[PDB]
Amino acid sequence: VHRLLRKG
Amino acid sequence: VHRLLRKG
Amino acid sequence: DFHWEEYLKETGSISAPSECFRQSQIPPVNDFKVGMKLEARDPRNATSVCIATVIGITGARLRLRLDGSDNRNDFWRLVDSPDIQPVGTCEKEGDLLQPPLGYQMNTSSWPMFLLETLNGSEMASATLFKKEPPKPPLNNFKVGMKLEAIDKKNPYLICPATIGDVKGDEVHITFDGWSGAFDYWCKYDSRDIFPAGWCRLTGDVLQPPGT
Amino acid sequence: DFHWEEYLKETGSISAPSECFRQSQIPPVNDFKVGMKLEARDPRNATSVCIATVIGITGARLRLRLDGSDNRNDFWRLVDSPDIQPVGTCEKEGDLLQPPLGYQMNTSSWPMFLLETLNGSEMASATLFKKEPPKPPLNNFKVGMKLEAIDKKNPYLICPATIGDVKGDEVHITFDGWSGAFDYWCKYDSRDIFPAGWCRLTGDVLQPPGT
Structure with missing residues (x-):
């Protein structure tokens, strides 16, 4: 599922 | 009569 | 769908009380x-x-x-x-x-x-x-206390964070789910840190944790 | 009770015509x-x-x-x-x-x-x-021509004056009834000199001669 989150 | 005029 | 009550129960931690902060209890x-x-x-x-x-x-x-x-x-x-x-x-x-x-x-x-x-x-x-709200007279933060803080390196962003160290009038802020690149020291009465619930109250957005 | 017609007749002189000046004929x-x-x-x-x-x-x-x-x-x-x-x-x-x-x-x-x-x-x-009025294209002043001029050393004052010398684009202004301390050179198109009748026209005051 997941991928590591970036910063918006 | 006269005296010499000054500057105003 | 992040929630403070659950997150704190999950990680066996407490949130810093509002009285530690130089922030109004009513924002x-x-x-x-x-x-x-x-x-x-x-x-x-x-x-x-x-x-x-x-x-x-x-x-x-x-x-x-x-x-x-x-x-x-x-x-x-x-x-x-x-x-x-x-x-x-x-x-x-x-x-x-x-x-x-x-x-x-x-x-x-x-x-x-x-x-x-x-x-x-x-x-x-x-x-x-x-x-301006008043300065609390003491540093009352304790290590492990959770709070909401501005990412100094990206300050449009407010994120869940934890007290990693407490030293004199200073606290070390770490951002849950991010590396040390995003950590920082500020004074306990810094205006860049907030008690959990701030974003909800103010209508700002709280960032999810990194992981 | 000074008057240009009489003063010029008296001293056997003429007033500079208005066309010498960089001043409007209608002020x-x-x-x-x-x-x-x-x-x-x-x-x-x-x-x-x-x-x-x-x-x-x-x-x-x-x-x-x-x-x-x-x-x-x-x-x-x-x-x-x-x-x-x-x-x-x-x-x-x-x-x-x-x-x-x-x-x-x-x-x-x-x-x-x-x-x-x-x-x-x-x-x-x-x-x-x-x-701004136009520059006359030539220096048409002649020695002895009478005019009305600002006392550069006291410029609230406009006084009867005479052309003492004419040299190229320049004129030497002397003030009737005053010593050389009050003389000066200006260009013929200077704005500090006026034809006789200027004060009357503009409602300014013309100073009497010195003597």
């Missing part, structure tokens, strides 16, 4: 509108008060830009920050208004530019500027 | 009022345009003072002089407004002072500023 209302004008300490030249414009509203914070600067150094300020004040405050004090560090025209142009940018401006009314 | 109307504001070249720093106030009205001339200066260096200008212009002319041109040489506050205060003195001011309307 301030932000009635500023984009386009308003104010005076702000130059975030890059702290001896300088400059004219600033509101570029954006988020929560209890203003995104500000120093007039006559490029668009590259916009900063954020809480409406109850002492670094912002209504237009005319310097004049009242007898102080000078300064050009910004990022000022883009020949320097001698300043006086005219000031004249030009202040005419017909919408100036933020005094009442919009809120009472 | 300009002076509709300025004390308190109005304008831009003026700094009479002591000719590269500088400064804000000036009308202190007095006399004839077709304005007694001016550069704002923020002491009361010691007031100057006179004809309403059709190119050294005065309406407020906003620099701005229109893209030029800077400068502080006066006689400026009495710390120099860094300039921008604020400008803001302070321009707000709510009565600004001299454009229409008050009159067409």
Whole structure:
């Protein structure tokens, strides 16, 4: 599922 | 009569 | 779908109580509108008060830009920050208004530019500027206490964070789910940290944890 | 009780014809009022345009003072002089407004002072500023010709004067009934000299001769 989150 | 005029 | 009660239960931790913070327990209302004008300490030249414009509203914070600067150094300020004040405050004090560090025209142009940018401006009314909250007299944070904090490296962002160390009048802030690249030290009475629930209250957005 | 016709008959002289002068044959109307504001070249720093106030009205001339200066260096200008212009002319041109040489506050205060003195001011309307008259293409003065001239050493005063010498584009002005201390050279197209009848026409006062 997941991928590591970036910063918006 | 006269005296010499000054500057105003 | 992140929630503080569950997250704290999950990680077996507590949130810092509101009384640790230099923040009002009832957060301030932000009635500023984009386009308003104010005076702000130059975030890059702290001896300088400059004219600033509101570029954006988020929560209890203003995104500000120093007039006559490029668009590259916009900063954020809480409406109850002492670094912002209504237009005319310097004049009242007898102080000078300064050009910004990022000022883009020949320097001698300043006086005219000031004249030009202040005419017909919408100036933020005094009442919009809120009472600065009092400094708690002690550092009451404890390691592991969870809180909401501004990512100093990306300050549009407020994120869940944890107290990693407590040392004298200072606290070490770490951001849950991020590396040390994003950690920082601030004083316990910093305005860049908030108790859990702040974003909900102010209508700002809290970032999810990193992982 | 001085009169030009009699005085010229008496001294066996003629008055310079109006065509020698850079002055309008119909003199300009002076509709300025004390308190109005304008831009003026700094009479002591000719590269500088400064804000000036009308202190007095006399004839077709304005007694001016550069704002923020002491009361010691007031100057006179004809309403059709190119050294005065309406407020906003620099701005229109893209030029800077400068502080006066006689400026009495710390120099860094300039921008604020400008803001302070321009707000709510009565600004001299454009229409008050009159067409500069054309330069005659030749020096047509002749020695002995009588005229009306400003005493450069006391310029509130306009006095009967005589052409003493004519040399190239220049004339030597001497003041009837005064010593050489009051003489001066100006260019034939100087704005400080006028044909006889100017004072009568403009409602200014002509000084009697010295003796």
